[PDB]
Amino acid sequence: SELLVNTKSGKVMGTRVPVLSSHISAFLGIPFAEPPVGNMRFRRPEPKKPWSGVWNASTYPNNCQQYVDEQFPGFSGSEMWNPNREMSEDCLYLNIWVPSPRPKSTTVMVWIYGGGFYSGSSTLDVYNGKYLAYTEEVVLVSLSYRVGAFGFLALHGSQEAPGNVGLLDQRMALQWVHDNIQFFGGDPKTVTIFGESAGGASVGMHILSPGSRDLFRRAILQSGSPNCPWASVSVAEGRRRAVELGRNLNCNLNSDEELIHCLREKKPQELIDVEWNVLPFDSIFRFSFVPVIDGEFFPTSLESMLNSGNFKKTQILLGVNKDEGSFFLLYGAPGFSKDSESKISREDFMSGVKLSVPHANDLGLDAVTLQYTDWMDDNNGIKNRDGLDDIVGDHNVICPLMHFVNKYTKFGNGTYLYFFNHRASNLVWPEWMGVIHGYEIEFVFGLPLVKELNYTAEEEALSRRIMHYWATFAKTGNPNEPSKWPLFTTKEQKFIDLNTEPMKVHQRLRVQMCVFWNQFLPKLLNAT
Template identity: 45%
Template sequence: MIFLLLASSGAILRCVSVLQKENARNVPASEKEELETVVNTTKGMVKGFITNSSLEKAVRVFYGIPYAQPPTGKRRFRRASSKQPWTDVFEATVKPNSCVQTIDDTYGNFSGSVMWNANTNMSEDCLKLNVWTPVPSSKKPLAVLVWIYGGGFYSGTSTLDVYDARNLVSEEDVIVVSMNYRVASLGFLSFGNELVPGNAGLYDQCMALKWVRDNIAAFGGDPNRVTLFGESAGAGSVALHVLSPLSRRLFKRAILQSGSGIAPWSFRSKRKAREAARKLARALGCPTGLDNKTLSCLRKKDPKDIVYNETNNGGVIDLAFGPVADGAFLPKSPRALVYDPAFETNISVMVGSNLNEGSYFLQYFFGFSATDQNPNITENNFTAAVKALNPSLGEPPMAEVLKQYTKGAVPSTPKDMLGGFGLDRR
């Protein structure tokens, strides 16, 4: 298992193998008491545990701290509401539920697929976050990194092994927070009206950031030195927080790994959002007027039935549900916000991309088998694939796209074609 290490004070990139205990239940009873750690938050006491990183350095871990009320019943599809205080000590020693989503079984038990599937029970009661801190805690408040997972806005969970932050906090002397947020239609359904304006998943993230602002000092963190970082849809989310008037004052820095808020896949027009909502309602046997009758019907459905009845709008990366301009979190489209003369921010941003990410699309959408060998790509299927990735573009813009990525000529060798797909050409 690999976790990408990033320090907010500079471009520190490191990959370290992680093989760790799942939770405090693995700690012998005789040692458990001295390995427990309790922190007082604004909502109540939370008890975590102390364990070692793979480099044998002590780390404090808190799993599954609730930051919002469970979005069940009438709260389904609504913006998250603040968690009510609790009186007993909350046991933050077990990984939290993952938010409801589909499971990828395309290649059976292929590890390259399974490693990204939700690895804890799925439930709508999933709005929890995790905190890792070094031990001993620094006398000076530490910088804070907040991780937002990717998954195309339809999948993902903070509990994956690759997101374990023990080595990061122990080696770089930072605090790491990760949160679960609603995905798929449960997190991004939009009727394009005030009834279901959309962006529930982004509001989840925003509420988690407010929790960090209000509580991270109790864990030894500096609320004035918070860096968001994410990959793919996580990076798209980070970019949207930079643009949002509701959240951009909750952090100082942002790291975008292979994602952008103005990428076509990271934003839905009102028309496409309403079209996807109607398709979903129709598939579930609900009224399609996108009114109270539709909402009431959808709230009665099993959450797993909802996510398994989603269909995209056509195109490889034209996903069914995602961020929209809701008038509040996003007053208008990300592109319009970026180019708005009134937009100002003092947030520092680091941007990067991921090698070999295009291999996913080759295997899942273009019929290439899952293999370590370079596929034999022809000029025809290269051009067809680029067009499939951009179905909304007409011929003149498509010609410019091909020119941009091929320097004016369609690549003729397999290595060059792999580069065009976003793969390693070495």
């Protein structure tokens, strides 16, 4: 039977699912690790013990314990990101969509979900792998990993809560794919890991980490890169945040063991309820528990690894969306709201920049402000709203990614860069947010091919070429079929726009602003 697969871990039984009036097989909720519960909370993951019998893999698994978004109760725009399954610490599962009839040795794609390292689920409707698996004939895998404190509480030096275990969860799922995807007809020597935002920063982290490199072939990073200012912290900051967490729960703080034992006695929601209280600054785009530069998963600082070429050398395809910062200003900067045009006053502009560059002294805040202010028209509310949007996006997503791509390309084997700027005709968010962080995912997963979601025909056509670009690149290391998406080179620095109009090639994506964020501002904060 087509729905039965025997793996090294045991037999698994899937289900047949309809797709664009055809069908494919899906093996949902396959365990790849022991449940990280009880005494295992905060611990490195453990491989799933093989099982006898047949594992029912016909339905989605639980989602990991996480902070649930309540800013807009019932609004689809935000609920589309919330867990759509029961939450549980027992959540280390993966899902596989397999073309029918079962391939023999085809291209494999593994998706790593985003969510600021504090949230996320592999079961979201926007991550439904059937459309892509079906249309491009690829074996599509979505893994899961512990988020928030469960995945990233870091007490460096302790073996009970070393930090980075959520990255180790991802690595375990990648190991499982490597060892078993052949039984589902996937070629383990041709697996592309792709992810968006924290998922994309994760993909870059596996590119850097010696212990992850051998487990995949190529990578795609969407609106995220390993060096993002919000994607990692030092072991000292990690420790300070773990201790502050314990301090919020009235924990004994005398030794690592006393703190960890207390945190392990608390119910999941107890940690989630005080998680946000540990940030060091009033800020936007900063999350409590994230990866730590520990000298293990990351042997040295991310910058020294990037500079010395200490990373997996292969082909990469990555890019950003036009209005990366809007999602974040809506949620936390004064003057912005879901139902107004959010024209921003000069005062709110300034408290907006302060929130965006939390770690900056005054000279630094002035530098940012001057750089983004049109002084011939300083009281223009649209200009102040769009300027903050750019500040947030350039600093947190775009410039860090442009710095990664320029460092990577020096040693890599091929880079393809895109700028996604199509505003979906059916976007439920206000127009002022533009082409929002996370909204290229739906085109990557092919949602525009299902008529009921009522997208336009050109949006469907757009989705199909992005899907074919991603799959052709996973299969060959080149998105083009033998108009061309040119290779990004350290000399030419070319990239393409991704939208419904005829492909247009450009160069040096946001260089002016990125020289300010990658070279000037850091020098300024280091001197003063």
